[PDB]
Design a protein around this ligand. Structure first.
Ligand SMILES: CC[C@H]1CN([C@@H](C)C(=O)O)C(=O)[C@@H]2CCC[C@H]1N2S(=O)(=O)c1cc(Cl)cc(Cl)c1
Ligand SMILES: CC[C@H]1CN([C@@H](C)C(=O)O)C(=O)[C@@H]2CCC[C@H]1N2S(=O)(=O)c1cc(Cl)cc(Cl)c1
Lengths: 128, 128
């Protein structure tokens, strides 16, 4: 499925080149610029575990998820992955546990040592 | 009704004591602990405008709402108010626009300078 395709075909976008964050662009954005660290970024996302099941989606709530990029306020895979995106882009990210919730997880809905898959759309970004 | 009761009897839980976030506990919860900064909190909620209009409910879409406390990834009134809640608690919050969507609003759903009312149930929270 979509997670496996990212496993197979995805660019390693980690600075460790440790394969901890893998990416496929699914829709090229109209934007020319990525967001900077500290920008307020507006995204829609869908998240799945390795067994393929949805664990979360901003679409379900019909309002974007907004965070400050590159501040450590989301999992490391998101700070790395969203920083690579242009306005309007949709990507698939695969996030190894070391770039997500690690050995502890976040029960109930993230197991220990879980690899996470996201479909992320960058809607907009604004300066701090 | 409920919004009037919180106006009259709600505690001002803001540090500035500006009546920006007023709270009444409607159903007492279980255990004495409250969530820490960064904890994932799981809630159900019902939200209304000052004219009585229901603007959103997590029950309507049968989807508990999950957020990370104290990161500014929800409106300020929620970071302040939910931090005071115990597991199983239901509270009523009344939120001045300075602690919600401000002069901009989130149009048309949330008008400019809107005071918001919530009934919030804290289902669970998970530490890290
Ligand atoms: C809950 C939303 C958020 C959780 N966080 C931060 C804010 C956190 O764990 O503190 C995350 O980094 C990632 C990516 C941004 C959206 C959400 N997650 S998430 O992996 O989809 C997620 C993680 C958990 Cl533990 C629960 C849910 Cl419902 C969703
Ligand atoms: C929709 C869920 C969420 C919206 N947000 C954030 C995430 C936002 O507007 O960016 C909120 O802070 C508050 C409090 C947490 C639950 C939701 N609201 S809300 O005031 O009910 C709300 C606000 C708007 Cl603009 C739309 C909807 Cl559908 C619901």
């Amino acid at each position: 499925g979509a997670p496996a395709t990212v496993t197979e075909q995805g660019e390693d976008i980690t600075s460790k080149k440790d394969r901890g964050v893998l990416k496929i662009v699914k829709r090229v954005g109209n934007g020319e610029e990525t967001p900077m660290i500290g920008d307020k970024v507006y995204v829609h996302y869908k998240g799945k575990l390795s067994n393929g099941k949805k664990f979360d989606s901003s679409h379900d709530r019909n309002e974007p998820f907004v965070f400050s990029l590159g501040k450590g306020q989301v999992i490391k895979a998101w700070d790395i992955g969203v920083a690579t995106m242009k306005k309007g882009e949709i990507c698939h990210l695969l996030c190894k546990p070391e770039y997500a919730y690690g050995s502890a997880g976040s029960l109930p809905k993230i197991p220990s040592n879980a690899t996470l898959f996201f479909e992320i759309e960058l809607l907009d970004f604004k300066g701090e």
